């Protein structure tokens, strides 16, 4: 299966996040790193982008997910706000799944959409900038989790967020 080779972009990462040495993994620490505050860096929300974004075409990757609450992942428009506390909503240009309250959610607004998908281990993300959609599938049977249909009007970046300790996200391949 042809998947994009992605690495987490340390210049974007919230300083509380810990990125693995291979730049595939992210979790939350309780120590803020002393990092330079670039305009691209998420200074309050616990977010990081991949270093690669996309303006056209179709792209796949997979995300290995922790069993416990605290993560959300998907894609963000490049213009996603980086500074101060921002909402985690489609209006803010984030299109994500989340594990919170021991429930899986598609992060719709104003109310999140609870998913009855069973336990998740690894999720395939299918980003389609030709038709305007981002879809999520559980890898065991490729059951469909959710599709956001979006007329994306800018470059779209893989998005990861971890807002509590005790969980993680990891990029494959």
């Amino acid at each position: 299966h042809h998947m994009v080779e992605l690495t987490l972009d340390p210049d974007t990462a919230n300083p509380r996040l810990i990125l693995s040495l291979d730049l595939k993994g992210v979790r939350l620490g309780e120590r803020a790193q002393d990092l330079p505050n670039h305009p691209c860096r998420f200074d309050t929300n616990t977010r990081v982008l991949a270093s690669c974004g996309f303006s056209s075409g179709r792209h796949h990757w997979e995300v290995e997910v922790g069993s416990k609450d605290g993560w959300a992942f998907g894609v963000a428009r490049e213009s996603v706000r980086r500074k101060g506390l921002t909402p985690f909503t489609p209006e803010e240009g984030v299109w994500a799944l989340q594990l919170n309250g021991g429930q899986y959610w598609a992060v719709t607004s104003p109310e999140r959409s609870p998913l009855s998908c069973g336990h998740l281990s690894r999720v395939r993300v299918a980003l389609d900038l030709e038709v305007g959609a981002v879809s999520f599938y559980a890898v065991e049977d490729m059951r469909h989790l959710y599709t956001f249909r979006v007329n994306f009007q800018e470059r779209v970046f893989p998005l990861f967020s971890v807002c509590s300790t005790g969980t993680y996200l990891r990029i494959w391949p």
């Binding site: 309050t44 929300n45 616990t46 609450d69 605290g70 959300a72 506390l85 985690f88 989340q98 919170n100 309250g101 967020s161 807002c163 509590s164």
Partner: peptide, 5 residues
């Protein structure tokens, strides 16, 4: 809980 997501 997810305020900072």
């Amino acid at each position: 809980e997810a305020l900072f997501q």
